Amino acid sequence: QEWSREEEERLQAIAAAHGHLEWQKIAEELGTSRSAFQCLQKFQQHNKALKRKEWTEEEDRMLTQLVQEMRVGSHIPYRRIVYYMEGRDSMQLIYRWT
DNA sequence: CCGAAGCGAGCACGGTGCTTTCCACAAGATATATAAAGCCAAGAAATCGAAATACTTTCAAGTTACGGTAAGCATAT
């Protein structure tokens, strides 16, 4: 069975109280009868730390270097930017050249 | 007719511990025939497994309609 949007709060609370070291004990103390890998995916999907914030200037240098080094025609491989630049997903990163 | 010289020679060398070509004619070989019985054995007909050239669905990617605050400039008091 899927979640009911009521266990992620206690999950992140226990993860912050323990230090995000061992997710197995966290899942066992949470009492969901599910594997740690099955709940960690939804935890990271509901987490906000995976995203980014207002754009700086020093990262523009790296983006321009990566473009001038591995861009082809009118297509830009933003997946390479996701691989190199941490924090940027594939959805909202394309705006960096839109 | 004896004499010299080769010359071939029996004689010794210790104790022990077979193939094929024909007359012999007396058997063999090949010949049906039931007849029950299961199996082996090659030629078709039916059946099923592997899969490739196709269809559904999943999944990555960018471009899409729709804001979230924030900053430079006009004009009233």
From Swiss-Prot:
Looking at the record, the residues that make up the HTH myb-type domain are 1-49
Myb-like domain segment(s): 50-98
Q: Where in the cell is it found?
A: Nucleus
Q: Which residues bind DNA?
A: 23-47
Q: Which disease is it linked to?
A: Neurodevelopmental disorder with motor regression, progressive spastic paraplegia, and oromotor dysfunction: An autosomal recessive disorder characterized by delayed motor development and developmental regression after the first year of life, followed by progressive spasticity with gait alterations, paraparesis, and oromotor dysfunction. Most individuals have cerebral, cerebellar, or basal ganglia volume loss.
Protein function: Part of the SNAPc complex required for the transcription of both RNA polymerase II and III small-nuclear RNA genes. Binds to the proximal sequence element (PSE), a non-TATA-box basal promoter element common to these 2 types of genes. Recruits TBP and BRF2 to the U6 snRNA TATA box.
Complex formation? Part of the SNAPc complex composed of 5 subunits: SNAPC1, SNAPC2, SNAPC3, SNAPC4 and SNAPC5. SNAPC4 interacts with SNAPC1, SNAPC2, SNAPC5, BRF2 and TBP.
The protein, known as: snRNA-activating protein complex subunit 4
Which lineage ranks, top first, belong to the organism behind this chain? Answer: Eukaryota, Metazoa, Chordata, Craniata, Vertebrata
Please give the first and last residues shown and the length of the full protein.
295 to 392 of 1469
